[PDB]
Amino acid sequence: AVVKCKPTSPGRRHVVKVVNPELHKGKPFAPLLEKNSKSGGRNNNGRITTRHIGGGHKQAYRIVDFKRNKDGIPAVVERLEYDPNRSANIALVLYKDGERRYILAPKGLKAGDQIQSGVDAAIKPGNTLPMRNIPVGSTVHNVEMKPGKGGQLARSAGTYVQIVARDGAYVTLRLRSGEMRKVEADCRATLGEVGNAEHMLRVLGKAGAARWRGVRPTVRGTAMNPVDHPHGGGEGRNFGKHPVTPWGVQTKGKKTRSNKRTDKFIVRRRS
Amino acid sequence: MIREERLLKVLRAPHVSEKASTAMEKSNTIVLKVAKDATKAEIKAAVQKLFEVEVEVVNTLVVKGKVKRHGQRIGRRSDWKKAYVTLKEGQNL
Amino acid sequence: MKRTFQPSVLKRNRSHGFRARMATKNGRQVLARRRAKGRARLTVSK
RNA sequence: GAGGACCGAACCGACUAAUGUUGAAAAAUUAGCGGAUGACUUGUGGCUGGGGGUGAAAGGCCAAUCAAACCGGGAGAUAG
RNA sequence: CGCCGGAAGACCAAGGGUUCCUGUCCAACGUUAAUCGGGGCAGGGUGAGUCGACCCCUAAGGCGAGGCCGAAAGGCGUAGUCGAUGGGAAACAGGUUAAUAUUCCUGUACUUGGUGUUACUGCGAAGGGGGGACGGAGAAGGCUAUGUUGGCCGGGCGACGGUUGUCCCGGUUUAAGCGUGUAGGCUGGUUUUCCAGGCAAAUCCGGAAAAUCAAGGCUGAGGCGUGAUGACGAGGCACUACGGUGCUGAAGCAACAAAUGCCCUGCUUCCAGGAAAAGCCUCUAAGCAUCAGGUAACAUCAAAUCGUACCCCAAACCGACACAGGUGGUCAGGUAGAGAAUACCAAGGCGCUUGAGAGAACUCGGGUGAAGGAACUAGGCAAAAUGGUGCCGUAACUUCGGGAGAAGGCACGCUGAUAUGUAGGUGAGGUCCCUCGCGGAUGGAGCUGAAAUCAGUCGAAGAUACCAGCUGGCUGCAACUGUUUAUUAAAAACACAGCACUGUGCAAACACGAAAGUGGACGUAUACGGUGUGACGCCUGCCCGGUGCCGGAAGGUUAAUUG
Ligand SMILES: [Mg+2]
Ligand SMILES: [Mg+2]
Ligand SMILES: [Mg+2]
Ligand SMILES: [Mg+2]
Ligand SMILES: [Mg+2]
Ligand SMILES: [Mg+2]
Ligand SMILES: [Mg+2]
Ligand SMILES: [Mg+2]
Ligand SMILES: [Mg+2]
Ligand SMILES: [Mg+2]
Ligand SMILES: [Mg+2]
Ligand SMILES: [Mg+2]
Ligand SMILES: [Mg+2]
Ligand SMILES: [Mg+2]
Ligand SMILES: [Mg+2]
Ligand SMILES: [Mg+2]
Ligand SMILES: [Mg+2]
Ligand SMILES: [Mg+2]
Ligand SMILES: [Mg+2]
Ligand SMILES: [Mg+2]
Ligand SMILES: [Mg+2]
Ligand SMILES: [Mg+2]
Ligand SMILES: [Mg+2]
Ligand SMILES: [Mg+2]
Ligand SMILES: [Mg+2]
Ligand SMILES: [Mg+2]
Ligand SMILES: [Mg+2]
Ligand SMILES: [Mg+2]
Ligand SMILES: [Mg+2]
Ligand SMILES: [Mg+2]
Ligand SMILES: [Mg+2]
Ligand SMILES: [Mg+2]
Ligand SMILES: [Mg+2]
Ligand SMILES: [Mg+2]
Ligand SMILES: [Mg+2]
Ligand SMILES: [Mg+2]
Ligand SMILES: [Mg+2]
Ligand SMILES: [Mg+2]
Ligand SMILES: [Mg+2]
Ligand SMILES: [Mg+2]
Ligand SMILES: [Mg+2]
Ligand SMILES: [Mg+2]
Ligand SMILES: [Mg+2]
Ligand SMILES: [Mg+2]
Ligand SMILES: [Mg+2]
Ligand SMILES: [Mg+2]
Ligand SMILES: [Mg+2]
Ligand SMILES: [Mg+2]
Ligand SMILES: [Mg+2]
Ligand SMILES: [Mg+2]
Ligand SMILES: [Mg+2]
């Protein structure tokens, strides 16, 4: 549910948080955890390659099954769990043979629901099938772009993809960005859409709430000196120039996609 | 065992001092200057062979040489190892 | 006030010690220059 | 029993005044002052290197050093 | 006599390195003298199976066989190998030195290995599983350290009125280990069958289905017993070479109070969702099956090496100084107090390495002040003032939380009574029950003990000292908390939650890289980057001529090339 906190403090006045009473209140499944060390946005040269990253709460990585290649074997949802590494929630499923895995929790899924992957699986939210076995027009998520590679599209909270057309060995998809893309039919997808759709309704409320998520402050380029940023200085507030990145590339309009390798799959660009 | 040629080199001198004397007449313990690289096993075997007494236990410590000043130049004395050798009750020297 | 030299023999040896100098070719040239000059103490040490 | 909540020591900071200014001190003392469960503070170790780093951005900081560190070299630069 | 006493005491780490102790010396060093010293000279001093390191294990990170990449130098990185600030076996009390002691001695323990014998015996890993193994906040229950009082024991009978008593002073200490499994926490237990999982195998883990039993198991402070007929012990008696040394040695209880320590790596709760690996337990594969190996008992052996002195708000460390500076962690007595504030003290440690006089101006740090009360001044700068607890009471405005401790006011000591000490807390004996114990119930002795009312009483004054908000009104700016010019600027500057635009379909954009690659991200458009704006409320009008960006592709122009 979406709840607004009462303004007992200036930092709590605008906080709007998302509560989910069905999330597991306990420790995650230990055999599916890994160390996830932070980077501060530094690469192997030790240089900051992505600004505004640093700090935040320590997080353990949950091994999520994005391939869903355990076909034929039914599985039941044990519980929904919070995952700090993504916006969506994850479900701990238990296969009939005793294996436990983590999957992205689709919308409407709850503890006790039964899911299955494979070409013979029923068409219902949570099941995974090759996209050539999925009816055209349906809404899917966790889509592969290469057969057997693992889902890469529509993984964020509340996202989904609809199959608009199928011909030959390819299907056409309408991504959440509004882009029409071709993907070969042997790629897999999970029925339904990703849960936790109200994730976008949350309001952090205070500056510290973003620091918990590992986001360092953003200094406006126009607030710097000319040596630091093209937006430079000036006596007072002066801009007088076209907006650019810190490295001089025109932002606010200039297209930067340059990939002739994958142009054949783009049916129509977003707009 | 330990070679006698090695045993004939680990013991250097009996340390003489007020603390060494009272340790001899109150705890039946002799104090010796031993080789810098001598172990408690070597010191025990050497005392039992050369002094022909029975040894209970050996305690060792390394003494750091003092930094003295000869006239106008500064020097430093060598470090040396000191051994507290405890004998059995009915033994003399 | 906190001055600039806060000693630590571990950091002193890891930054200027002998094995640190011998690690790279530039550090080995430092030792070469100091041997050529005739320094009594090549590196930091006890 | 929530809170970048309140009052207030340690702790961190540095708003005012006086003193000091060949100082007790190459930035402090004294009396007050701000924060004080947090975007907090601190220890140990590590990483980022000079047209480079880092910067809640003051051209700030990078060993009492900064609109381009230090050391050696070109080098006895050139100096109407 | 004075000062510190959450330190100016005690102890570690770091850092220093002989500054430690004794004898001796006083040139220089010491902001003076110096017989003294952290100074000179000589001698002495650091004792470990259990403390630390080393060692085993890994984090960030480093290095990196091959490898990939690069004019060369080199860069990155796999297998690996290093790397604590983290995980991993074991000792306590007393005594002793001029100087060391959890190291020596005394007493009483413990751990891990090796070898041996005996009894029993499926062992076996570079593999599987378990475990190790983990957040913040909050709550309050049980405890202890510790303290207070009583009792007990020893001593005392007071330089000046009183002091054989409801009087004074001192002591009333004892560990690890071993046994007991408590307050309390967690978890159903056992057996059988089966199974696409744990890369193979698995008796293990996971899953499925039965039957059966309901109490079983794990964890666990403290208490109690033992350790201990011991040690320690006020003191006394001896010698003193006058520092000390020797001998002897009483009581050694109870109640109450009580932690920020322990139970607690718990419990509850929240979102920002909270290391790794080994030791350890278990499982089998290859293999080995007489063996080997494992488990148990006893015996025996081993536990090396290095560190260990001394200093640590410091004259020994970082600051050129015996420098009002800086320096991580541990310990935490009494009275008052909410308190680790503050005042005065204990243990303990100090009087800060020039003094002696004098009692001018003036400067510094303070005290008091007639009448006036901001007339001062750029400006109430500075100073003065306010200051506690309880209760009463409290405006505009408001985002309904606030504003608010608004403002303002009253009470406040001591003695007695209520009540020879109350409400409350604690809880003995007794009694009863018990599936019997560290049990339950009842029971109330003793101990501790607010707050209030009434009456009385002293002073000019009872929150008496230290300690401890000035308040209100109008308005600019910034929503707020926060950040910043180390060393003249703390702000209206920066950030901020929120908003918008824009880029980005994942081998993402983008950034660092001659490259390999890495970050972005083990993320996937409810995501990420960039830019501007800056909570919230009401809003955000007109201009696409210029510049930029996006789209367009007909035409004009136009490079290498071609010749
Ligand atoms: Mg922003
Ligand atoms: Mg500026
Ligand atoms: Mg520029
Ligand atoms: Mg202007
Ligand atoms: Mg011994
Ligand atoms: Mg030793
Ligand atoms: Mg360094
Ligand atoms: Mg606060
Ligand atoms: Mg405060
Ligand atoms: Mg101050
Ligand atoms: Mg405040
Ligand atoms: Mg400027
Ligand atoms: Mg500087
Ligand atoms: Mg030249
Ligand atoms: Mg010249
Ligand atoms: Mg000396
Ligand atoms: Mg001395
Ligand atoms: Mg003198
Ligand atoms: Mg001396
Ligand atoms: Mg190589
Ligand atoms: Mg490498
Ligand atoms: Mg290692
Ligand atoms: Mg000592
Ligand atoms: Mg394991
Ligand atoms: Mg007690
Ligand atoms: Mg008298
Ligand atoms: Mg009298
Ligand atoms: Mg119990
Ligand atoms: Mg020692
Ligand atoms: Mg010591
Ligand atoms: Mg100390
Ligand atoms: Mg001190
Ligand atoms: Mg000092
Ligand atoms: Mg500090
Ligand atoms: Mg105090
Ligand atoms: Mg005077
Ligand atoms: Mg007056
Ligand atoms: Mg008057
Ligand atoms: Mg007046
Ligand atoms: Mg005036
Ligand atoms: Mg005037
Ligand atoms: Mg003032
Ligand atoms: Mg005042
Ligand atoms: Mg009255
Ligand atoms: Mg105005
Ligand atoms: Mg502000
Ligand atoms: Mg502020
Ligand atoms: Mg400044
Ligand atoms: Mg300032
Ligand atoms: Mg406009
Ligand atoms: Mg165009």
PDB file of C-alpha atoms in Angstrom, chain A residues 77-271:
ATOM      1  CA  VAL A  77       5.805 -20.001  -4.598  1.00  0.00           C
ATOM      2  CA  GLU A  78       6.950 -20.142  -0.989  1.00  0.00           C
ATOM      3  CA  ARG A  79       7.082 -16.421  -0.241  1.00  0.00           C
ATOM      4  CA  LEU A  80       7.704 -12.998  -1.713  1.00  0.00           C
ATOM      5  CA  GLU A  81      10.908 -11.321  -0.596  1.00  0.00           C
ATOM      6  CA  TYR A  82      12.410  -7.858  -0.649  1.00  0.00           C
ATOM      7  CA  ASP A  83      15.442  -7.501  -2.917  1.00  0.00           C
ATOM      8  CA  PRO A  84      17.727  -4.478  -2.402  1.00  0.00           C
ATOM      9  CA  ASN A  85      19.450  -4.959  -5.768  1.00  0.00           C
ATOM     10  CA  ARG A  86      16.427  -4.160  -7.940  1.00  0.00           C
ATOM     11  CA  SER A  87      13.161  -2.260  -7.940  1.00  0.00           C
ATOM     12  CA  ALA A  88      11.048  -5.388  -8.308  1.00  0.00           C
ATOM     13  CA  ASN A  89      10.317  -7.976  -5.650  1.00  0.00           C
ATOM     14  CA  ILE A  90      11.446 -11.574  -5.937  1.00  0.00           C
ATOM     15  CA  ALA A  91       9.662 -14.836  -5.192  1.00  0.00           C
ATOM     16  CA  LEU A  92      11.272 -17.908  -3.655  1.00  0.00           C
ATOM     17  CA  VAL A  93       9.907 -20.881  -5.592  1.00  0.00           C
ATOM     18  CA  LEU A  94      10.225 -24.562  -4.729  1.00  0.00           C
ATOM     19  CA  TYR A  95      10.379 -27.073  -7.548  1.00  0.00           C
ATOM     20  CA  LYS A  96       8.905 -30.548  -7.225  1.00  0.00           C
ATOM     21  CA  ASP A  97      12.358 -32.141  -7.108  1.00  0.00           C
ATOM     22  CA  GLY A  98      13.378 -30.039  -4.103  1.00  0.00           C
ATOM     23  CA  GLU A  99      15.327 -27.207  -5.735  1.00  0.00           C
ATOM     24  CA  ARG A 100      14.728 -23.627  -4.614  1.00  0.00           C
ATOM     25  CA  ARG A 101      15.286 -20.622  -6.854  1.00  0.00           C
ATOM     26  CA  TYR A 102      14.631 -16.893  -6.961  1.00  0.00           C
ATOM     27  CA  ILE A 103      12.488 -15.414  -9.728  1.00  0.00           C
ATOM     28  CA  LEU A 104      11.108 -11.974 -10.440  1.00  0.00           C
ATOM     29  CA  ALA A 105       7.691 -11.773  -8.821  1.00  0.00           C
ATOM     30  CA  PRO A 106       5.070 -10.971 -11.474  1.00  0.00           C
ATOM     31  CA  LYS A 107       1.951  -8.984 -10.732  1.00  0.00           C
ATOM     32  CA  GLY A 108      -0.738 -10.905  -8.889  1.00  0.00           C
ATOM     33  CA  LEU A 109       1.533 -13.737  -7.787  1.00  0.00           C
ATOM     34  CA  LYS A 110       1.270 -14.833  -4.169  1.00  0.00           C
ATOM     35  CA  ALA A 111       2.451 -17.612  -1.894  1.00  0.00           C
ATOM     36  CA  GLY A 112       0.968 -20.929  -2.965  1.00  0.00           C
ATOM     37  CA  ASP A 113       0.653 -20.228  -6.684  1.00  0.00           C
ATOM     38  CA  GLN A 114       2.026 -22.842  -9.064  1.00  0.00           C
ATOM     39  CA  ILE A 115       4.224 -21.905 -12.025  1.00  0.00           C
ATOM     40  CA  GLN A 116       5.965 -23.865 -14.753  1.00  0.00           C
ATOM     41  CA  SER A 117       8.310 -23.273 -17.671  1.00  0.00           C
ATOM     42  CA  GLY A 118       8.607 -25.035 -21.009  1.00  0.00           C
ATOM     43  CA  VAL A 119       6.818 -25.352 -24.313  1.00  0.00           C
ATOM     44  CA  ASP A 120       3.916 -27.194 -22.659  1.00  0.00           C
ATOM     45  CA  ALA A 121       3.298 -24.744 -19.816  1.00  0.00           C
ATOM     46  CA  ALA A 122      -0.126 -23.182 -19.443  1.00  0.00           C
ATOM     47  CA  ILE A 123      -0.650 -19.555 -20.434  1.00  0.00           C
ATOM     48  CA  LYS A 124      -0.930 -17.791 -17.068  1.00  0.00           C
ATOM     49  CA  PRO A 125       1.103 -15.154 -15.209  1.00  0.00           C
ATOM     50  CA  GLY A 126       4.379 -16.616 -13.993  1.00  0.00           C
ATOM     51  CA  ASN A 127       4.853 -19.278 -16.660  1.00  0.00           C
ATOM     52  CA  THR A 128       7.796 -19.111 -19.056  1.00  0.00           C
ATOM     53  CA  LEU A 129       7.538 -20.211 -22.682  1.00  0.00           C
ATOM     54  CA  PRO A 130       9.379 -19.627 -25.941  1.00  0.00           C
ATOM     55  CA  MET A 131       7.790 -16.605 -27.558  1.00  0.00           C
ATOM     56  CA  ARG A 132       6.648 -18.633 -30.564  1.00  0.00           C
ATOM     57  CA  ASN A 133       4.335 -20.568 -28.223  1.00  0.00           C
ATOM     58  CA  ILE A 134       2.852 -17.388 -26.711  1.00  0.00           C
ATOM     59  CA  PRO A 135      -0.250 -15.876 -28.359  1.00  0.00           C
ATOM     60  CA  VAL A 136       0.264 -12.610 -30.197  1.00  0.00           C
ATOM     61  CA  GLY A 137      -0.993  -9.621 -28.242  1.00  0.00           C
ATOM     62  CA  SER A 138      -0.214 -11.043 -24.813  1.00  0.00           C
ATOM     63  CA  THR A 139       1.701  -9.146 -22.140  1.00  0.00           C
ATOM     64  CA  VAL A 140       5.005 -10.674 -21.044  1.00  0.00           C
ATOM     65  CA  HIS A 141       8.117  -9.722 -19.108  1.00  0.00           C
ATOM     66  CA  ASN A 142      11.681 -10.899 -18.495  1.00  0.00           C
ATOM     67  CA  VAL A 143      12.264 -11.282 -22.211  1.00  0.00           C
ATOM     68  CA  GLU A 144      15.385 -12.776 -23.742  1.00  0.00           C
ATOM     69  CA  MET A 145      17.075 -11.224 -26.751  1.00  0.00           C
ATOM     70  CA  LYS A 146      19.170 -14.309 -27.548  1.00  0.00           C
ATOM     71  CA  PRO A 147      17.819 -17.836 -27.030  1.00  0.00           C
ATOM     72  CA  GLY A 148      19.109 -19.313 -23.799  1.00  0.00           C
ATOM     73  CA  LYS A 149      20.850 -16.113 -22.715  1.00  0.00           C
ATOM     74  CA  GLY A 150      18.475 -15.014 -19.963  1.00  0.00           C
ATOM     75  CA  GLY A 151      15.814 -12.350 -19.631  1.00  0.00           C
ATOM     76  CA  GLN A 152      17.014  -8.812 -20.250  1.00  0.00           C
ATOM     77  CA  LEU A 153      13.933  -6.758 -21.193  1.00  0.00           C
ATOM     78  CA  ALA A 154      11.116  -5.663 -18.886  1.00  0.00           C
ATOM     79  CA  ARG A 155      12.692  -6.510 -15.549  1.00  0.00           C
ATOM     80  CA  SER A 156      12.002  -3.308 -13.623  1.00  0.00           C
ATOM     81  CA  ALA A 157       9.036  -2.956 -11.294  1.00  0.00           C
ATOM     82  CA  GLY A 158       5.731  -2.705 -13.122  1.00  0.00           C
ATOM     83  CA  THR A 159       7.237  -3.048 -16.592  1.00  0.00           C
ATOM     84  CA  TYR A 160       6.053  -5.400 -19.324  1.00  0.00           C
ATOM     85  CA  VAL A 161       6.271  -6.106 -23.042  1.00  0.00           C
ATOM     86  CA  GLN A 162       3.483  -6.917 -25.490  1.00  0.00           C
ATOM     87  CA  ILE A 163       4.000  -9.088 -28.563  1.00  0.00           C
ATOM     88  CA  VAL A 164       2.465  -7.136 -31.425  1.00  0.00           C
ATOM     89  CA  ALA A 165       3.347  -9.365 -34.364  1.00  0.00           C
ATOM     90  CA  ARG A 166       4.984 -12.662 -35.277  1.00  0.00           C
ATOM     91  CA  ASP A 167       6.349 -13.688 -38.664  1.00  0.00           C
ATOM     92  CA  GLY A 168       8.846 -16.309 -39.742  1.00  0.00           C
ATOM     93  CA  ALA A 169      11.435 -16.785 -37.020  1.00  0.00           C
ATOM     94  CA  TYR A 170      10.967 -13.352 -35.431  1.00  0.00           C
ATOM     95  CA  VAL A 171       8.407 -11.587 -33.280  1.00  0.00           C
ATOM     96  CA  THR A 172       7.911  -7.849 -32.916  1.00  0.00           C
ATOM     97  CA  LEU A 173       7.763  -6.385 -29.415  1.00  0.00           C
ATOM     98  CA  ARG A 174       6.611  -3.020 -28.103  1.00  0.00           C
ATOM     99  CA  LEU A 175       9.022  -2.175 -25.305  1.00  0.00           C
ATOM    100  CA  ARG A 176       8.101   0.075 -22.395  1.00  0.00           C
ATOM    101  CA  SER A 177      10.086   2.852 -24.066  1.00  0.00           C
ATOM    102  CA  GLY A 178       7.657   2.749 -26.981  1.00  0.00           C
ATOM    103  CA  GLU A 179      10.207   1.186 -29.330  1.00  0.00           C
ATOM    104  CA  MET A 180       9.290  -1.616 -31.722  1.00  0.00           C
ATOM    105  CA  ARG A 181      11.985  -4.285 -31.774  1.00  0.00           C
ATOM    106  CA  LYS A 182      12.380  -7.631 -33.518  1.00  0.00           C
ATOM    107  CA  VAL A 183      13.406 -10.648 -31.440  1.00  0.00           C
ATOM    108  CA  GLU A 184      13.721 -14.190 -32.727  1.00  0.00           C
ATOM    109  CA  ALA A 185      10.896 -16.490 -31.714  1.00  0.00           C
ATOM    110  CA  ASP A 186      13.021 -19.020 -29.814  1.00  0.00           C
ATOM    111  CA  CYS A 187      13.664 -16.456 -27.076  1.00  0.00           C
ATOM    112  CA  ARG A 188      11.764 -17.001 -23.843  1.00  0.00           C
ATOM    113  CA  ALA A 189       9.460 -14.717 -21.898  1.00  0.00           C
ATOM    114  CA  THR A 190       7.394 -14.920 -18.730  1.00  0.00           C
ATOM    115  CA  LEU A 191       3.668 -14.278 -18.855  1.00  0.00           C
ATOM    116  CA  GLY A 192       2.177 -11.339 -17.020  1.00  0.00           C
ATOM    117  CA  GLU A 193       3.939  -8.198 -15.909  1.00  0.00           C
ATOM    118  CA  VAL A 194       6.431  -7.430 -13.171  1.00  0.00           C
ATOM    119  CA  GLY A 195       4.873  -6.737  -9.794  1.00  0.00           C
ATOM    120  CA  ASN A 196       5.441  -3.861  -7.389  1.00  0.00           C
ATOM    121  CA  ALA A 197       3.907  -1.439  -9.875  1.00  0.00           C
ATOM    122  CA  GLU A 198       3.435   1.271  -7.243  1.00  0.00           C
ATOM    123  CA  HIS A 199       7.208   1.478  -6.788  1.00  0.00           C
ATOM    124  CA  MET A 200       7.143   4.727  -8.769  1.00  0.00           C
ATOM    125  CA  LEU A 201       4.735   6.333  -6.295  1.00  0.00           C
ATOM    126  CA  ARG A 202       7.261   6.477  -3.461  1.00  0.00           C
ATOM    127  CA  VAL A 203       8.684   9.829  -2.394  1.00  0.00           C
ATOM    128  CA  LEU A 204      12.054   9.815  -0.673  1.00  0.00           C
ATOM    129  CA  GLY A 205      11.214  12.930   1.326  1.00  0.00           C
ATOM    130  CA  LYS A 206      14.662  14.000   2.471  1.00  0.00           C
ATOM    131  CA  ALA A 207      18.203  14.271   1.165  1.00  0.00           C
ATOM    132  CA  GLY A 208      19.396  11.469   3.413  1.00  0.00           C
ATOM    133  CA  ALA A 209      16.946   9.022   1.878  1.00  0.00           C
ATOM    134  CA  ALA A 210      18.858   9.223  -1.393  1.00  0.00           C
ATOM    135  CA  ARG A 211      22.165   8.791   0.428  1.00  0.00           C
ATOM    136  CA  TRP A 212      20.908   5.459   1.766  1.00  0.00           C
ATOM    137  CA  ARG A 213      20.582   4.297  -1.834  1.00  0.00           C
ATOM    138  CA  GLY A 214      24.185   5.199  -2.600  1.00  0.00           C
ATOM    139  CA  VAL A 215      23.502   8.421  -4.511  1.00  0.00           C
ATOM    140  CA  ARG A 216      25.937  11.254  -3.911  1.00  0.00           C
ATOM    141  CA  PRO A 217      24.953  14.884  -4.535  1.00  0.00           C
ATOM    142  CA  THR A 218      24.833  16.345  -8.038  1.00  0.00           C
ATOM    143  CA  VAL A 219      26.546  19.701  -8.491  1.00  0.00           C
ATOM    144  CA  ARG A 220      25.092  21.812 -11.274  1.00  0.00           C
ATOM    145  CA  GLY A 221      27.608  22.666 -13.960  1.00  0.00           C
ATOM    146  CA  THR A 222      26.612  26.321 -13.906  1.00  0.00           C
ATOM    147  CA  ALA A 223      27.655  26.460 -10.238  1.00  0.00           C
ATOM    148  CA  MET A 224      31.281  25.618 -11.032  1.00  0.00           C
ATOM    149  CA  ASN A 225      34.260  27.519 -12.410  1.00  0.00           C
ATOM    150  CA  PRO A 226      35.120  27.525 -16.124  1.00  0.00           C
ATOM    151  CA  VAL A 227      38.028  25.152 -15.549  1.00  0.00           C
ATOM    152  CA  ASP A 228      35.658  22.556 -14.084  1.00  0.00           C
ATOM    153  CA  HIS A 229      32.699  22.547 -16.474  1.00  0.00           C
ATOM    154  CA  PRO A 230      31.769  24.089 -19.825  1.00  0.00           C
ATOM    155  CA  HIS A 231      28.869  25.820 -18.082  1.00  0.00           C
ATOM    156  CA  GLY A 232      31.602  27.801 -16.400  1.00  0.00           C
ATOM    157  CA  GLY A 233      31.288  30.695 -14.007  1.00  0.00           C
ATOM    158  CA  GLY A 234      30.319  34.303 -14.528  1.00  0.00           C
ATOM    159  CA  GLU A 235      29.710  37.194 -12.161  1.00  0.00           C
ATOM    160  CA  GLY A 236      26.348  36.226 -10.741  1.00  0.00           C
ATOM    161  CA  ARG A 237      24.123  33.716 -12.487  1.00  0.00           C
ATOM    162  CA  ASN A 238      25.177  33.619 -16.146  1.00  0.00           C
ATOM    163  CA  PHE A 239      24.594  30.842 -18.653  1.00  0.00           C
ATOM    164  CA  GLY A 240      24.797  32.255 -22.205  1.00  0.00           C
ATOM    165  CA  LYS A 241      25.733  28.977 -23.891  1.00  0.00           C
ATOM    166  CA  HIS A 242      24.187  25.819 -25.219  1.00  0.00           C
ATOM    167  CA  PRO A 243      23.754  23.116 -22.562  1.00  0.00           C
ATOM    168  CA  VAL A 244      26.405  20.405 -22.746  1.00  0.00           C
ATOM    169  CA  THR A 245      27.720  17.485 -20.741  1.00  0.00           C
ATOM    170  CA  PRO A 246      30.781  17.994 -18.523  1.00  0.00           C
ATOM    171  CA  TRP A 247      32.769  16.800 -21.550  1.00  0.00           C
ATOM    172  CA  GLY A 248      31.311  19.297 -24.006  1.00  0.00           C
ATOM    173  CA  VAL A 249      28.780  17.090 -25.801  1.00  0.00           C
ATOM    174  CA  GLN A 250      25.472  18.813 -26.479  1.00  0.00           C
ATOM    175  CA  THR A 251      22.738  17.497 -24.210  1.00  0.00           C
ATOM    176  CA  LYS A 252      19.009  18.221 -24.492  1.00  0.00           C
ATOM    177  CA  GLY A 253      18.385  16.811 -27.928  1.00  0.00           C
ATOM    178  CA  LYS A 254      21.499  15.366 -29.533  1.00  0.00           C
ATOM    179  CA  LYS A 255      21.063  11.683 -30.336  1.00  0.00           C
ATOM    180  CA  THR A 256      23.978   9.509 -29.268  1.00  0.00           C
ATOM    181  CA  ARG A 257      23.002   6.029 -30.458  1.00  0.00           C
ATOM    182  CA  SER A 258      25.634   4.851 -32.940  1.00  0.00           C
ATOM    183  CA  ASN A 259      25.287   1.096 -33.390  1.00  0.00           C
ATOM    184  CA  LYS A 260      24.993  -0.166 -36.945  1.00  0.00           C
ATOM    185  CA  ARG A 261      25.237  -3.764 -35.733  1.00  0.00           C
ATOM    186  CA  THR A 262      21.764  -3.852 -34.167  1.00  0.00           C
ATOM    187  CA  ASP A 263      19.922  -1.446 -36.471  1.00  0.00           C
ATOM    188  CA  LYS A 264      18.341  -4.346 -38.359  1.00  0.00           C
ATOM    189  CA  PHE A 265      16.302  -5.301 -35.281  1.00  0.00           C
ATOM    190  CA  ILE A 266      14.878  -1.832 -34.580  1.00  0.00           C
ATOM    191  CA  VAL A 267      11.528  -1.693 -36.358  1.00  0.00           C
ATOM    192  CA  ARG A 268      10.746   1.832 -35.169  1.00  0.00           C
ATOM    193  CA  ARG A 269      12.577   4.067 -32.728  1.00  0.00           C
ATOM    194  CA  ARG A 270      10.892   5.423 -29.626  1.00  0.00           C
ATOM    195  CA  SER A 271       9.147   8.785 -29.756  1.00  0.00           C
TER     196      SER A 271
END
